[PDB]
RNA sequence: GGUACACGAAAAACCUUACCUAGACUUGACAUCCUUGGCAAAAUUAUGGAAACAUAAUGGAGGUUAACCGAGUGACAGGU
RNA sequence: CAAACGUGCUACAAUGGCCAAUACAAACAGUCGCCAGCUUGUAAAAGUGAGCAAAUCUGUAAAGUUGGUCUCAGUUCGGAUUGAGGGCUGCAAUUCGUCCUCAUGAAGUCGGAAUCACUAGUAAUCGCGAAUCAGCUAUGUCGCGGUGAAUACGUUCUCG
């Protein structure tokens, strides 16, 4: 569309269109929506320039969607440049919080790389 | 062109360390174990 | 996470040694068993020997490591390679 | 003539049932042998607690038995008592199991 | 190894069109134990049928379900390799029941939209002997006709 | 001359009051319109199932008090309640009502969960291997 | 190592959260009924002798 | 194997805990029997302390030793 | 923690997602507790604070009914993972507590060979309570109720 480099679907309502932006989710989209007073359920294609400037202004007032990626990136580098054990745990692509790593937590380990289970000839 | 800096952390957390240190120096040994008290019996025939 | 009213937490044994050790110029590693003490602004510049479980690993605190817990910058277990079962 | 106690609300509870009925019969008989208008020996719902315990010592959680303990409850409210009833109330001797909740 | 024949629960006459069979198909489309939801879905489809076919919904439903009802049933009987099938005459109760089960099963797989229109289209598509349930009935009938020889031996 | 009936089903009482009237029955459940007290999911006919095949033209004013259960269980209670009140006005009605088995407590209640089982009759998955 | 833990449990600890409940007849630590202060396998023996008034077998 | 695998465990941050690394103890943290006295154990405040534990303090309910507080003392206690 | 298996939860959706209004339970538990109402807070919760030693007071029932919207998309599905800010318990939450808010949005569109349970208030499903417990991704265990099915012709095969 016209809001920064994001191309919000044209045939979709504005409150979901704001979610399509990286730095704006759903709850925060409603906050901008209520604050700007623009009524929801108004398809973005059937919207005028008067709303397109106010919404951009409040979005600019909030944290820029493009800066958040580098903000998370600096934070990981900030965590790794300290030498924290949590940083180390985030370092080797493993659960950072307290999640178990015995039989689960594959969403951070990608696909399974099947090895060879021990050979049991009986005892 | 740079708008100086708006980060640096510290300051915000600094107030938190001050709050924690003030608590630690405040610490009063108010050790206790309980709440409501009395009204604890099984009654009788008021004299048997 | 940790509440506001409570604030931070040090055992106050580590705090007393740090105050004494900062005044003394010829500082040496401080042997602390308290992995539970959060790093306070005054800790900056000192070095500590946190008990990993077996030995005392030396950590040099900076103006950046401020805020987390003193045991968080040291490990406790070690795993580096498996072994083919079959 | 006097009262000295209006609305004497006797409450009964016990782990056993037959003893509870027996105590109500004895209480009613004495209190009607004196000049008191008993409202009636009404029954209250019995609070039942159940504890589940595994039979086996080490393994087999599936085999677990159960036990129960019923708190049978009754209510009895006396309108006017007076010394004539109260003094006779001293010689009642309530079997241990029954528990009294005299509320004056 | 049982020697006892199971009892049967009542079928209940329908509450609208007074056609028992409606309650059966309601129970068939049941999912998650929602009696309410299922009635609504089904009843909405008759209203769509009115809007489209301009005829009585009960008559259309009978014309669809009665046309779908099969005649022969193929029971699997293995001896040594594979199974030689055996065509047997299915009872009247099972005839309606099997018809209803197929109607629902091909209805919850159509490319259409909300299952109201989905299920509505299947029944109207089955009143003219051209649909998905029809093909299933056609296939089993042809399989039975092909395996006519072994019908004499059952067990 | 009113009539009283007490039905029950799934731990749900019922107090049905049969009052002679000649100005439309005006079915009523717990001082509220039946269409609002029930999901009106066509459940209203059921309670009237024994009051339909005989008659409702006698315009019996119904005063229903039900306290307990869900909504089908409450409906089951009043049908039995309607039938039990019906057993005081023209004992002939009983015969035909007995036939359809509309004068019997359903006796069906939810079973107790058993230990080692995931429900009344369910059981854990069995793994041999 | 049983006797020392039993004695330590009776003794008051230096922190409130350091206090746990152990069976009073035996020394079993886990599966202790606070309603009776008796572990699950002593409660069975006691219940089968009539020592606890009112605990009868259940039929539900 | 069926008859193990949301099992013992109806609650592993400390405690639990039976494991490892360390800092401390030896008729012992707990008990009896014996010669012998009771004019305490607690808890808490100080200093050193990771805390165990030490050195100083209010010296403590009570009942004259009942229970326990001890000394001496070898049989022994103790072992998940 | 390179991996494998068992038992469950959540899903892959319009028999649905979200929002608003709203009707109907049983059982159990409760004075270091249940906590009503009120005030503050986007919320977890905090403060005030009655009532209840209990058929009295407290522990919001949800599915369900109606209305609005989505219009079949890896999406207003799905919630994982990750970053930050908060609340509670507790000396103490980094190893290793959980809850809330914001941010992100993995896989997954019905699952191969082969397997499990169930014969009515049962299967399926929706909530509620208790035990151990200061607190606890118990989705576990033991209980309670709401809605509520389909099928059994027969012993030829299969297991015991
Ligand atoms: Mg964990
Ligand atoms: Mg032992
Ligand atoms: Mg075995
Ligand atoms: Mg431990
Ligand atoms: Mg003295
Ligand atoms: Mg003496
Ligand atoms: Mg031994
Ligand atoms: Mg389960
Ligand atoms: Mg909807
Ligand atoms: Mg009242
Ligand atoms: Mg995909
Ligand atoms: Mg989702
Ligand atoms: Mg944490
Ligand atoms: Mg699809
Ligand atoms: Mg059976
Ligand atoms: Mg399910
Ligand atoms: Zn025990």
UniProtKB/Swiss-Prot annotation, chain B:
Cellular-component GO terms for this entry: ribonucleoprotein complex; ribosome
Family of the protein in this entry: Belongs to the bacterial ribosomal protein bL31 family. Type A subfamily.
Amino acid composition bias (Basic and acidic residues), ranges on this chain: 34-48
Highest rank taxon of the organism: Bacteria
Protein's name according to its UniProt entry: Large ribosomal subunit protein bL31
Keywords: Ribonucleoprotein, Ribosomal protein, RNA-binding, rRNA-binding
Source taxonomy: Bacteria, Bacillati, Mycoplasmatota, Mycoplasmoidales, Mycoplasmoidaceae
Record's keyword annotation contains Zinc-finger: no
GO BP, one annotated term: translation
Part of the intact protein present: 50 to 97 of 97
Subunit structure: Part of the 50S ribosomal subunit.
Region feature Disordered, mapped onto this chain: 27-48
Purpose: Binds the 23S rRNA.
GO terms assigned for molecular function: rRNA binding; structural constituent of ribosome
Curated annotation (Swiss-Prot), chain C:
Domain of life of the native organism: Bacteria
InterPro entries, alphabetized: Ribosomal_uS19 (IPR002222), Ribosomal_uS19_bac-type (IPR005732), Ribosomal_uS19_CS (IPR020934), Ribosomal_uS19_SF (IPR023575)
RNA-binding is among the record's keywords: yes
One family name in Pfam for this protein: Ribosomal_S19
Stretches assigned to coiled coil: none
Record's keyword annotation contains Nucleotide-binding: no
A molecular-function term among this protein's GO annotations: rRNA binding
UniProtKB keywords: Ribonucleoprotein, Ribosomal protein, RNA-binding, rRNA-binding
Cellular component GO terms, alphabetical: cytoplasm; small ribosomal subunit
GO biological process: ribosomal small subunit assembly; translation
Annotated S-S bridges: none
Function: Protein S19 forms a complex with S13 that binds strongly to the 16S ribosomal RNA.
The family this protein is said to belong to: Belongs to the universal ribosomal protein uS19 family.
Identification of the protein by name: Small ribosomal subunit protein uS19
Species, as recorded: Mycoplasma pneumoniae (strain ATCC 29342 / M129 / Subtype 1)
Curated annotation (Swiss-Prot), chain D:
Keywords tagged on the record: Ribonucleoprotein, Ribosomal protein
GO molecular function, one term: tRNA binding
PROSITE patterns named among the record's database cross-references: RIBOSOMAL_S10
SUPFAM superfamilies: Ribosomal protein S10 (SSF54999)
Alphabetical GO biological process terms: translation
Presence of keyword Ribosomal protein: yes
Pfam families, A to Z: Ribosomal_S10
Any one cellular-component term (Gene Ontology): ribosome
Entry-linked InterPro entries: Ribosomal_uS10 (IPR001848), Ribosomal_uS10_CS (IPR018268), Ribosomal_uS10_dom (IPR027486), Ribosomal_uS10_dom_sf (IPR036838)
HAMAP family: Ribosomal_uS10
Subunit: Part of the 30S ribosomal subunit.
Biological function: Involved in the binding of tRNA to the ribosomes.
NCBIfam families the UniProt entry points to: PRK00596.1, rpsJ_bact
Family label: Belongs to the universal ribosomal protein uS10 family.
Protein name, entry field: Small ribosomal subunit protein uS10
Organism listed in the record: Mycoplasma pneumoniae (strain ATCC 29342 / M129 / Subtype 1)
UniProtKB/Swiss-Prot annotation, chain F:
GO biological process: translation
Domain of life: Bacteria
Pfam families from the UniProt entry: Ribosomal_S9
Keywords noted in UniProt: Ribonucleoprotein, Ribosomal protein
Record GO terms (molecular function): RNA binding; structural constituent of ribosome
Gene3D superfamilies recorded: 3.30.230.10
Ribosomal protein keyword on record: yes
Any one Gene Ontology cellular component term annotated for this protein: cytosolic small ribosomal subunit
Residue spans crossing the bilayer: none
Protein family according to the UniProt entry: Belongs to the universal ribosomal protein uS9 family.
Protein name in the entry: Small ribosomal subunit protein uS9
Organism: Mycoplasma pneumoniae (strain ATCC 29342 / M129 / Subtype 1) (Mycoplasmoides pneumoniae)
Lineage: Bacteria, Bacillati, Mycoplasmatota, Mycoplasmoidales, Mycoplasmoidaceae
Gene name tied to this protein: rpsI
């Amino acid at each position: 569309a016209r809001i920064l480099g994001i191309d919000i679907p044209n045939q979709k309502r504005i409150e979901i269109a704001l979610t399509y932006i990286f730095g704006i989710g759903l709850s925060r989209s409603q906050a901008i929506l209520k604050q700007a007073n623009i009524n929801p359920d108004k398809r973005v294609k059937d919207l005028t320039e008067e709303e397109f400037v106010a919404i951009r202004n409040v979005a600019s007032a909030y944290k820029i969607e493009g800066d958040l990626r580098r903000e998370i990136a600096l934070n990981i580098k900030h965590l790794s440049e300290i030498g924290a054990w949590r940083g180390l745990r985030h370092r080797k692509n493993l659960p950072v919080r307290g999640q178990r790593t015995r039989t689960n937590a594959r969403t951070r380990k990608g696909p399974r790389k099947t090895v060879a289970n021990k050979k049991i000839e009986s005892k | 062109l740079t708008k100086q800096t708006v980060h640096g952390r510290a300051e915000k957390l600094s107030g938190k360390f001050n709050a924690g240190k003030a608590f630690l120096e405040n610490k009063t040994p108010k050790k206790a174990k309980g709440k409501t008290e009395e009204y604890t019996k099984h009654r009788s025939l008021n004299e048997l | 996470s940790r509440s506001a009213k409570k604030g931070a937490f040090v055992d106050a044994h580590l705090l007393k040694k740090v105050i004494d050790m900062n005044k003394q110029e010829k500082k040496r590693p401080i042997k602390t068993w308290s992995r539970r003490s959060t790093i306070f602004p005054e800790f900056v510049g000192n070095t500590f020997a946190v008990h990993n479980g077996k030995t005392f690993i030396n950590v040099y605190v900076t103006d950046d490591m401020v805020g987390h817990k003193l045991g968080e910058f040291s490990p406790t277990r070690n795993f580096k390679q498996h072994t083919a079962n079959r | 003539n006097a009262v000295k106690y209006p609305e004497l609300k006797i409450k009964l509870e016990s782990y056993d049932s037959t003893l509870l009925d027996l105590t109500t019969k004895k209480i009613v008989e004495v209190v009607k042998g004196v000049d008191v208008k008993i409202k009636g020996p009404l029954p209250l719902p019995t609070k039942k607690e159940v504890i589940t315990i595994i039979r086996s010592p080490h393994v087999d959680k599936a085999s677990r038995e159960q036990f129960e303990k019923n708190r049978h409850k009754r209510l009895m409210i006396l309108v006017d008592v007076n010394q004539g009833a109260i003094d006779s109330l001293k010689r009642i001797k309530i079997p241990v199991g029954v528990t009294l909740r005299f509320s004056k | 190894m049982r020697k006892n024949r199971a009892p049967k629960r009542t079928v209940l006459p329908d509450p609208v069109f007074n056609n028992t069979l409606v309650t059966r198909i309601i129970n068939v489309i049941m999912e998650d134990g929602k009696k309410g939801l299922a009635q609504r879905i089904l009843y909405g489809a008759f209203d769509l049928i009115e809007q489209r076919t301009k005829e009585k919904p009960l008559t259309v439903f009978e014309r669809a379900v009665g046309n779908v009802m099969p005649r022969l049933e193929l029971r699997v009987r293995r001896i040594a390799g594979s199974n030689y099938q055996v065509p047997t005459e299915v009872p009247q109760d099972r005839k309606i029941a099997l018809a209803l089960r197929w109607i629902a099963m091909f209805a919850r797989k159509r490319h259409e939209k909300t299952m109201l229109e989905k299920i509505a289209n299947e029944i109207i598509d089955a009143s003219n002997n051209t649909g998905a349930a029809i093909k299933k009935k056609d296939d089993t009938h042809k399989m039975a006709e092909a395996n006519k020889a072994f019908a004499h031996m059952r067990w | 001359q009113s009539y009283y009936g007490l039905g029950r089903r799934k731990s749900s009482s019922a107090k049905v009051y049969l009052t002679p009237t000649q100005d439309k029955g005006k079915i009523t459940v717990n001082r509220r319109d039946p269409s609002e007290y029930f999901p009106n999911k066509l459940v209203i006919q059921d309670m009237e199932q024994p009051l339909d095949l005989t008659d409702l033209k006698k315009n019996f004013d119904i005063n229903v008090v039900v306290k307990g259960g869900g909504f089908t269980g409450q409906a089951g209670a009043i049908r039995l309640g309607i039938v039990r009140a019906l057993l005081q006005f023209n004992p002939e009605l009983k015969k035909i009502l007995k036939s359809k088995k509309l004068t019997t407590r359903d006796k069906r209640v939810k079973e107790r969960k058993k230990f080692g089982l995931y429900g009344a009759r369910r059981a854990p998955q069995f793994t041999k291997r | 190592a049983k006797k020392s833990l039993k004695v330590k449990q009776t003794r008051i600890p230096k922190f409130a959260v350091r206090a746990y409940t152990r069976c009073q007849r035996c020394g079993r630590a886990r599966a202790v009924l606070s309603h009776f202060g008796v572990c699950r396998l002593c409660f069975r023996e006691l219940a089968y002798a009539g020592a606890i008034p009112g605990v009868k077998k259940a039929s539900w």
